[PDB]
Design a protein around this ligand. Structure first.
Ligand code: THP
Ligand code: CA
Length: 129
């Protein structure tokens, strides 16, 4: 997989962010994760965690997987990095997202994500408390 440049337009919620990619505004939905909705338990904390990660980043990067790059809503599907740290994995490691929506061919980082969930679970963090 390859990391590509993007710039933050605005945080949206725990698992979607608006970025400018190849000069076009796009909503990205993070691969392999599911955060609670803002109205749900840990939803505000998830939104906060992602917002802080992307707003504080000097460099945001988009990494597409091998499969579908847009979902049925027109959202980009990618792993998003903030100064080299994957947001998708970070949310899971903190117990603020579950591994989810794992579809064959867009699952390169599935094992990394599941390993993070296991650790978050063993720690009883947030969703796992
Ligand atoms: C993460 C992801 C979501 N989706 C679609 C599946 C779900 O369809 P449905 O809307 O019919 O439930 C929706 C959930 O996204 P959200 O968790 O943002 O609601 O996004 C993909 O198709 N591929 C993906 O990789
Ligand atoms: Ca969600």
């Amino acid at each position: 997989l390859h990391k590509e440049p993007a710039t933050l337009i605005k945080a949206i919620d725990g698992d979607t962010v608006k970025l400018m990619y190849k000069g076009q505004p796009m909503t990205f939905r993070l691969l392999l994760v599911d955060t609670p909705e803002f109205n749900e338990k840990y939803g505000p904390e998830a939104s906060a965690f992602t917002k802080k990660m992307v707003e504080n980043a000097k460099k945001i990067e988009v990494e597409f997987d091998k499969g579908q790059r847009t979902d049925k809503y027109g959202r980009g599907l990618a792993y998003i990095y903030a100064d080299g740290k994957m947001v998708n994995e970070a949310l899971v490691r903190q117990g603020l997202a579950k591994v989810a929506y794992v579809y064959k061919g867009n699952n390169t980082h599935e094992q990394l994500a599941r390993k993070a969930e296991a650790q978050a679970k063993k720690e009883k963090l947030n969703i796992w408390s």
